[PDB]
Scaffold this active site. Structure first.
Site, PDB file in Angstrom:
ATOM      1  N   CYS C 155      -6.859  26.922  59.944  1.00  0.00           N
ATOM      2  CA  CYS C 155      -7.761  26.382  58.935  1.00  0.00           C
ATOM      3  C   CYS C 155      -6.987  25.706  57.817  1.00  0.00           C
ATOM      4  O   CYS C 155      -7.073  24.484  57.611  1.00  0.00           O
ATOM      5  CB  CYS C 155      -8.607  27.517  58.352  1.00  0.00           C
ATOM      6  N   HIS C 182      -9.448  31.351  51.969  1.00  0.00           N
ATOM      7  CA  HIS C 182      -9.740  31.391  53.393  1.00  0.00           C
ATOM      8  C   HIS C 182     -10.961  32.260  53.639  1.00  0.00           C
ATOM      9  O   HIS C 182     -11.025  33.394  53.159  1.00  0.00           O
ATOM     10  CB  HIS C 182      -8.550  31.923  54.188  1.00  0.00           C
TER      11      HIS C 182
HETATM   12  N1  LIG Z   1     -14.437  30.050  63.822  1.00  0.00           N
HETATM   13  C1  LIG Z   1     -13.499  29.150  63.554  1.00  0.00           C
HETATM   14  O1  LIG Z   1     -13.794  27.774  63.502  1.00  0.00           O
HETATM   15  C2  LIG Z   1     -12.116  29.642  63.265  1.00  0.00           C
HETATM   16  C3  LIG Z   1     -11.920  30.319  62.066  1.00  0.00           C
HETATM   17  C4  LIG Z   1     -10.879  31.226  61.939  1.00  0.00           C
HETATM   18  C5  LIG Z   1     -10.030  31.449  63.012  1.00  0.00           C
HETATM   19  N2  LIG Z   1     -10.225  30.785  64.187  1.00  0.00           N
HETATM   20  C6  LIG Z   1      -9.309  31.033  65.311  1.00  0.00           C
HETATM   21  O2  LIG Z   1      -9.950  30.673  66.512  1.00  0.00           O
HETATM   22  C7  LIG Z   1      -9.934  31.710  67.462  1.00  0.00           C
HETATM   23  C8  LIG Z   1     -11.376  31.985  67.819  1.00  0.00           C
HETATM   24  O3  LIG Z   1     -12.122  31.764  66.645  1.00  0.00           O
HETATM   25  P1  LIG Z   1     -13.695  32.049  66.648  1.00  0.00           P
HETATM   26  O4  LIG Z   1     -14.325  31.218  65.608  1.00  0.00           O
HETATM   27  O5  LIG Z   1     -14.113  31.912  68.054  1.00  0.00           O
HETATM   28  O6  LIG Z   1     -13.762  33.591  66.210  1.00  0.00           O
HETATM   29  P2  LIG Z   1     -14.941  34.517  66.775  1.00  0.00           P
HETATM   30  O7  LIG Z   1     -14.823  35.890  66.235  1.00  0.00           O
HETATM   31  O8  LIG Z   1     -16.257  33.912  66.474  1.00  0.00           O
HETATM   32  O9  LIG Z   1     -14.684  34.483  68.360  1.00  0.00           O
HETATM   33  C9  LIG Z   1     -14.588  35.641  69.149  1.00  0.00           C
HETATM   34  C10 LIG Z   1     -15.133  35.241  70.512  1.00  0.00           C
HETATM   35  O10 LIG Z   1     -14.135  35.376  71.501  1.00  0.00           O
HETATM   36  C11 LIG Z   1     -14.713  35.905  72.672  1.00  0.00           C
HETATM   37  N3  LIG Z   1     -13.708  36.653  73.442  1.00  0.00           N
HETATM   38  C12 LIG Z   1     -13.031  37.774  73.045  1.00  0.00           C
HETATM   39  N4  LIG Z   1     -12.191  38.137  74.040  1.00  0.00           N
HETATM   40  C13 LIG Z   1     -12.326  37.261  75.058  1.00  0.00           C
HETATM   41  C14 LIG Z   1     -11.715  37.170  76.297  1.00  0.00           C
HETATM   42  N5  LIG Z   1     -10.949  38.172  76.716  1.00  0.00           N
HETATM   43  N6  LIG Z   1     -12.055  36.145  77.153  1.00  0.00           N
HETATM   44  C15 LIG Z   1     -13.001  35.216  76.778  1.00  0.00           C
HETATM   45  N7  LIG Z   1     -13.605  35.316  75.543  1.00  0.00           N
HETATM   46  C16 LIG Z   1     -13.273  36.321  74.698  1.00  0.00           C
HETATM   47  C17 LIG Z   1     -15.901  36.740  72.235  1.00  0.00           C
HETATM   48  O11 LIG Z   1     -16.936  36.628  73.180  1.00  0.00           O
HETATM   49  C18 LIG Z   1     -16.317  36.099  70.928  1.00  0.00           C
HETATM   50  O12 LIG Z   1     -17.438  35.272  71.136  1.00  0.00           O
HETATM   51  C19 LIG Z   1      -9.322  32.927  66.804  1.00  0.00           C
HETATM   52  O13 LIG Z   1      -8.110  33.233  67.444  1.00  0.00           O
HETATM   53  C20 LIG Z   1      -9.037  32.522  65.378  1.00  0.00           C
HETATM   54  O14 LIG Z   1      -7.688  32.780  65.069  1.00  0.00           O
HETATM   55  C21 LIG Z   1     -11.248  29.891  64.322  1.00  0.00           C
END
Ligand SMILES: NC(=O)c1ccc[n+]([C@@H]2O[C@H](COP(=O)([O-])OP(=O)(O)OC[C@H]3O[C@@H](n4cnc5c(N)ncnc54)[C@H](O)[C@@H]3O)[C@@H](O)[C@H]2O)c1
Ligand SMILES: NC(=O)c1ccc[n+]([C@@H]2O[C@H](COP(=O)([O-])OP(=O)(O)OC[C@H]3O[C@@H](n4cnc5c(N)ncnc54)[C@H](O)[C@@H]3O)[C@@H](O)[C@H]2O)c1
Ligand SMILES: NC(=O)c1ccc[n+]([C@@H]2O[C@H](COP(=O)([O-])OP(=O)(O)OC[C@H]3O[C@@H](n4cnc5c(N)ncnc54)[C@H](O)[C@@H]3O)[C@@H](O)[C@H]2O)c1
Ligand SMILES: NC(=O)c1ccc[n+]([C@@H]2O[C@H](COP(=O)([O-])OP(=O)(O)OC[C@H]3O[C@@H](n4cnc5c(N)ncnc54)[C@H](O)[C@@H]3O)[C@@H](O)[C@H]2O)c1
Ligand SMILES: NC(=O)c1ccc[n+]([C@@H]2O[C@H](COP(=O)([O-])OP(=O)(O)OC[C@H]3O[C@@H](n4cnc5c(N)ncnc54)[C@H](O)[C@@H]3O)[C@@H](O)[C@H]2O)c1
Lengths: 337, 340, 368, 368, 337
Positions: C155, C182
């Site tokens: 981010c 953040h």
């Molecule tokens: N949401 C964002 O735009 C954003 C913000 C912060 C961080 N991130 C980074 O992006 C990554 C994902 O972010 P996010 O927004 O999806 O967070 P999130 O918490 O919304 O996503 C978690 C998702 O991952 C899935 N998941 C967990 N284990 C899995 C596996 N073994 N196989 C397939 N799916 C699995 C779950 O179903 C859940 O929907 C994270 O590693 C984080 O570091 C993204």
């Protein structure tokens, strides 16, 4: 055509203008507002709101007062005396008092005394004002009345679909209550206030209260007087609120019968005004709904065939002022006076 | 002894009252409030606060304009203008300007005129004869009877000033930029359309409000060696009573690592300014820095010195109750210095 | 066309969802979701987001494990380990790591050998085997078969890398200290998580958690020179998705009136760094910067200078919408250079592509 | 126990084999071979060098897909692609890419998801995703499973990293154009031949084919100070197995003579760089530096400096016995840097232990 | 003396230990906990909580497992299998399952199978478990039962004073509902969940739900079965919640009669358990109340002499675990098995 200023272009005032500009069928001559606050700041904070991010159009302060939103010039002045606000400064058809302080018949008459002709109070009828919720008696509101009031977002919510409940079924008794959003009507911190409950920070602080809901449900709805009466809950949300009420219907209903009556009325007397919804959800997807109330018919459960725990989201801020634009049209359209 | 009337029952006012009650040395005899809400207001904002919650003691509700607190009969003057409370009729030795709106010279000058003999103000006073005497540094620069109406700049200052002195004495500040995570200030409103309020006319809370407060350089006056050496932004956080100032410099020293920097802090935070500076090293967040009677809570667990001259000090502070502790430090010290 | 069985229907999953299908013209054409959350949730968090609320577009629930965003037929596979996931069972070329579990190099490779070709993680990963690209600096390092497991900068760094480019390229940090706010992401819990670090084992959106974050120290993959020119920390903040980076830095040009700083920041913002780098000046709160396509929105009015050298530069980044934009931008540039850029060559060279299979053929032996 | 389904039994394959088997403290007890060598010949070639001649130990022929060095049962698989390999089918843990084809980082991962855990390319890897190690500098860069896909550096670089650790740190490069003369490997052409290359397509084992090497900037992976201070040429000498490098580069520190250079080089050789860095002085020839465990047997007398700045260091070395000894130690260093992980066993990091597994544990979530 | 570990030393587990340490009359041998999370982190996050700032008492981690907050060594291990958790590792008298995952009779029996003797489930009786709210049937709970459950903070709140309502008055019907705090039982963001409502961010997101309130009100209270039954509202507060219910009392009451019955029962069967309060206020002064429910008797208004809109704050987190310490004493004290 409807010469209309909004006394107190605050978040209710900004919200009403946002509704009107998003709205079409606009004989509302929104060419003037009122804001003793920064009128340039009025333009800016109308240009930006969480309910819509920025404005839902391009604003353009034609002048210190004039704001040509999308080119639609709109005055806004820094005035306080209702006999002085921009009402006869440009011959206002219908007054809108977004400040909340001149909700009374006195303040509205003073708005007219500035040189206006009709008034629409944002709050319900402050005692001696005919309150006109959008859904019940704003239809019965022939525009001949000068000082009217669209009933509160609480009542704007409740009165139409609760008239569905008490007419399609009829209700012995109900403790009507609205889980209304905490608003600027409270103390930002645990500061002084005439309501030591609204005195706390009020952000995440509950407010069981009694807004224009309790009076307006009786006034607009002779069916729902006293027996269908109660309190309000200016709950700690800043977004689309919900109604909270467990009636005891006269004619015994069930959950799906309530949902069906609310749906068919959302087809006849609640369409656009209301919206039946059946999803386990929260305002973050009910936000900015044009309806008076997003009827959460899924959990309006009915035990004993009379206890109808009604759930209905309701755009306490946005769709409130949407229905206020509806009543402002019912003023502009069907301009009886 | 030090006659106490609060100009409006402030959040700082109630916090100071609860401090004083939790303070022991305090000669601050709570006797009046200029609370234009009534005894029910001053009660259910004192007796019902949030930072210290329900008040630890009994705000004994004697008549609206004269109540008590654990047998501290406290008047109320539900009235505004500093003159309006008659600080002579109530003999208020130290005014506590709870409002922080009459921060000017004549503002609390009216406090004095209605009969105060000294005043303390809960914000970087906009008045010159109103020295924002801060705890930690220039509460000592307050010779008694010297500019009777002394202000106390915001807890952003009450944090910075002491440990920015500590930085310039133990590490040395060339040009220290600051960005305090101060609360969403009262010069805002909960929602948009606040007032003139140039930027903060937005909602106070629903977003971070990074606005350079006067406190940023209200540490400059209190620290005569911090001239221009703090250009700061009070990122008015959406959090009611807590903050952490932070300083980054092209430091006067080479920029010895934040370890010995915070060691000199620890010695200052436990010596010169204990109860004032706290070298927080446990990984903790606003909850413990809430109610932090410390002027500063240096989160030394996060202070860093990257490029040497690049330094960073992460100094938390409870910015209202801890700020009220600052104001009680000021009031107690002044009372000790008082002619009586 | 470019397909993703989005690893996890996470908040970034639905970020790039409500911005890929939203990207009416996305070469990325998602046709399947890799998530154990069901199509009901795939909608009710995609069709019903928090930032954009209800999806301003249909997500037609085809079935419990299949759906169609406005008719865009996208499955849901209640399966987690990448190897057994339909990047080959549906020929899905692209994968975006919206989980936080297979962030490792070969972990995202499991997407590849489960039928993907490359992966972009929307977060910093477990090494240089995931060389992150950023829309503005090093996104063009890419072709197909070029760094299949890569990432997008975090981010803060998704915001940073293009405008820390526009900074250190012309303005140039001698040595800096970055502090950013953040959103309360999966690093914490709504309650006091028993998380690895007690700093952010704290509740997510309860206190401002000073989350000392070295993502700004990953510049080695995208802008290594800014090492020793930076010291980043995030601020875990109670706000769902909108944020702001800030960076006070002594500049090589010393006295750098934030005005000239912002001037060049417009110049490359209006230059190469459009859509990722804004340089704003209106005194505004996060909602105004909310859903800003620009990862960086340099808040010029809040950009001041401390010691002449110490210009303070402050870019609001709607961190997860900043993602939802930059994932689209980066994944689409790649999509153009993905096996969407697959072609042939000349006899002396196409047969050398056969060598790319037949390494020890004729004279294809060279280099150790 | 650090068995390797040796990813290519060949010249360096059997070099490392003859070395790690010859080595006693080698956990790299390969028990399986990934090679079209065929025990019968796999033994033979392993049994038969030219640098080492007939192998200085028995390599008993167990059965077609299995043999035993003196009675060391080691399987043999004539497989090519890493996925279809007994890295799981025999539970292997370390990979050595003797193929010279799977330099690709995920292509090396193919071993791990075939059940291995770490790969080593016995040559330059596919790029800068892979911090290579050669014994003496940065094997510690690898922590248990840290940079599982890695490489051992090539003749020039296998030489370089240790003695450039001694050089650019005490001597200190400014810039220059490295000159190494290296044997013809199986990645060249004995006669002239065409398919992809031209230089090493030409008769590499006949003429001194003038071959450059950008692996001089593969130091980018390990020692950043040398970046922009080198660019090499690997003179493809037609000698069987010996290489030598010389760092003809201007020197910052006082451009001293190769003498002091060799003096500090003897120091750090006898210091942290023994077995790998040797600095001899006798007027000698390639055989005197063949079979050299060190990847750098500098001839101090033949080292000179004339321009002051342009140092010359004739780091001679059996280019594969140097290799094979290095991959032994290297993989051994990792072999020890393997499991380890002292049990904290506080149940406090048991959250962290299962959180390395389940990041989003019942309460340990990090990184969305 | 009461050998007791808390399975899952999370915020419910931390809160229970905070209650117990603040509590006196402690035959609770709290010398062991369970937390598969960081047990050192368990000590830290017990050492610090918004409801109490830091811990009421204080300590590091007495090594790690063992922990003596200036009070008494307390083990805590990182275990998951209930047949393995520290139950027979030190012969646990009474099991406490703060996780929420082994709320079932199966999980509790497995807790015993680890070598424990009795179980107290933090949730109400998960189907085949005798739920024992503090206020109604925990008195009737002779400790002979091994696998019991203190009913949810929802029910811990409601059952005592709603038994006052349905016994001192008797109630025809009531849509019982609790404005419960949103908890860690939901999705921090709009993430996957088996309850697409508890799937939103849940921080400021409403949760009309049905926790152990609806079942436990029937189970602990034969009077309040079905006719006195309804749903729950895991509302977006993180602090002391409120109950929301409009009964239709059999014997017609009035507002002050309800308040008086609740007061006299807060003198006989609700003292300490409950607390009558009559102030327009919010949890920021009801926080950390030891009672099951802070009875907001002021606004329990009664229209039609039967519609009792009951308001009662209730320490959903702190005083919940306070009453859980009460039931843990009723296990320790009057140790029938
Ligand atoms: N949401 C964002 O735009 C954003 C913000 C912060 C961080 N991130 C980074 O992006 C990554 C994902 O972010 P996010 O927004 O999806 O967070 P999130 O918490 O919304 O996503 C978690 C998702 O991952 C899935 N998941 C967990 N284990 C899995 C596996 N073994 N196989 C397939 N799916 C699995 C779950 O179903 C859940 O929907 C994270 O590693 C984080 O570091 C993204
Ligand atoms: N809040 C709700 O959900 C809802 C419910 C019931 C009633 N209402 C109506 O909404 C309003 C709520 O009050 P509010 O303060 O939020 O309104 P608002 O959000 O429109 O803000 C009013 C603003 O007007 C300005 N103002 C005050 N007096 C003025 C004057 N005389 N001339 C010009 N400007 C002036 C003030 O600075 C204030 O900021 C009331 O008018 C009430 O009738 C709304
Ligand atoms: N409260 C603090 O700890 C502290 C910290 C930062 C800033 N301030 C300053 O205090 C001012 C108030 O904001 P706050 O949120 O900090 O609350 P506060 O505690 O400082 O003061 C608020 C109180 O001031 C009173 N008040 C305002 N004008 C008054 C007047 N005319 N006469 C009598 N009482 C008056 C109100 O009744 C209210 O109770 C702001 O201008 C701010 O700059 C105080
Ligand atoms: N031998 C060395 O020290 C040297 C040095 C650096 C790199 N290399 C690389 O090694 C390769 C061969 O050179 P060499 O003659 O020195 O022999 P070598 O020891 O390096 O490896 C040769 C062996 O690799 C095997 N091999 C080739 N492709 C394979 C595959 N895909 N799967 C399994 N095994 C495979 C061959 O069977 C051969 O026996 C070259 O391509 C070169 O890139 C060799
Ligand atoms: N939340 C309320 O107001 C209220 C209402 C009804 C029921 N409850 C009870 O409170 C609990 C609510 O769940 P919660 O997650 O908030 O509880 P909690 O706050 O005590 O946290 C539980 C923690 O235990 C850990 N854990 C999970 N499994 C474990 C295992 N088997 N061994 C050791 N540790 C483990 C998890 O990491 C989790 O963080 C439920 O047990 C329920 O019975 C509370």
């Amino acid at each position: 055509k409807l010469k209309v200023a909004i006394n107190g272009f605050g978040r209710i005032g900004r919200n009403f203008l946002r509704c009107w500009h998003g709205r079409k069928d606009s004989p509302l001559d929104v060419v003037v507002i009122n804001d003793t606050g920064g009128v340039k700041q009025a333009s800016h904070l109308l240009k930006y709101d969480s309910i819509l991010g920025t404005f839902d159009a391009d604003v353009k302060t034609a002048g210190d007062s004039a704001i040509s939103v999308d080119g639609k010039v709109i005055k806004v002045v820094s005035d306080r005396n209702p006999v002085n606000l921009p009402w006869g400064d440009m011959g206002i058809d219908l007054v809108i008092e977004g400040t909340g302080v001149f909700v009374d018949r006195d303040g509205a008459g003073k708005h007219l005394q500035a040189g206006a002709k009709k008034v629409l109070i944002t709050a319900p009828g402050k005692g001696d004002i005919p309150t006109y919720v959008v859904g019940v008696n704003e239809e019965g509101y022939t525009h001949a009345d000068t000082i009217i009031s669209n009933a509160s977002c609480t009542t704007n919510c409740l009165a139409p679909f609760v008239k569905v409940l008490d007419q399609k079924f009829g209700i012995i008794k109900g403790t009507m209550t609205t889980t209304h959003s905490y608003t600027g009507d409270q103390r930002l911190l645990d500061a002084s206030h005439r309501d030591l409950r609204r005195a706390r920070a009020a952000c995440l602080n509950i407010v069981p209260t009694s807004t224009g809901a309790a009076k307006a449900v009786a006034l607009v709805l002779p069916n729902l007087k006293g027996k269908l009466n109660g309190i309000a809950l200016r709950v700690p949300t800043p977004n689309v609120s919900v109604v909270d009420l467990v009636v005891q219907v006269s004619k015994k209903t069930f959950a799906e019968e309530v949902n069906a009556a609310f749906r068919e009325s959302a087809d006849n007397e609640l369409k656009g005004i209301l919206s039946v919804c059946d999803e386990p959800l929260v305002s973050i997807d009910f936000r900015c709904t044009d309806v008076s109330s997003t009827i959460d018919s899924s959990l309006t459960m009915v035990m004993g065939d009379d206890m109808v725990k009604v759930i209905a989201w309701y755009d306490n801020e946005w769709g409130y002022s949407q229905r206020v634009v509806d009543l402002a049209d019912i003023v502009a359209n069907k301009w009886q006076x | 002894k030090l006659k106490v009337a609060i100009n409006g029952f402030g959040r700082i006012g109630r916090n100071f009252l609860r401090c004083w009650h939790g303070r022991k040395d305090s000669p601050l005899d709570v006797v009046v409030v200029n609370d234009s809400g009534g005894v029910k207001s001053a009660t259910h904002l004192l007796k019902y606060d949030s930072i210290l919650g329900t008040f630890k003691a009994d705000v004994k509700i004697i008549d609206n304009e004269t109540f008590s607190i654990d047998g501290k009969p406290i008047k109320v003057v539900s009235n505004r203008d500093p003159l309006k409370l008659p600080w002579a009729e109530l003999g208020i030795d130290i005014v506590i300007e709870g409002t922080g709106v009459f921060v000017d010279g004549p503002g609390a000058g009216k406090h004095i005129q209605a009969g105060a003999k000294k005043v303390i103000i809960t914000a970087p006073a906009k008045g010159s004869d109103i020295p924002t005497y801060v705890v930690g540094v220039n509460e000592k620069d307050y010779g008694h009877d010297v500019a009777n109406i002394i202000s106390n700049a915001s807890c952003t200052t009450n944090c910075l000033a002491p440990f920015v002195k500590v930085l310039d004495e133990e590490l040395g500040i060339v040009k220290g930029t600051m960005t305090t995570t101060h609360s969403y200030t009262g010069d805002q409103r909960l929602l948009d359309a606040s007032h003139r309020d140039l930027r903060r006319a937005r909602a106070a809370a629903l977003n971070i409000v990074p606005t350079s407060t006067g406190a940023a350089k209200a540490v400059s006056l209190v620290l005569p060696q911090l001239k221009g050496k703090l250009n700061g932004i009070a990122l008015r956080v959406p959090t009611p009573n807590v903050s952490v100032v932070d300083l980054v410099v092209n430091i006067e020293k080479v920029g010895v690592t934040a370890e010995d920097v915070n060691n000199a802090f620890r010695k200052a935070a436990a010596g010169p300014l204990k109860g004032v500076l706290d070298v927080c090293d446990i990984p903790l967040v606003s909850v413990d820095f809430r109610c932090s009677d410390f002027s500063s809570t240096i989160d030394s667990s996060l202070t860093m010195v990257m490029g040497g001259d690049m330094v960073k000090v992460v100094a938390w502070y409870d910015n209202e109750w801890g700020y009220s502790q600052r104001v009680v430090d000021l009031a107690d010290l002044v009372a000790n210095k008082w002619p009586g």
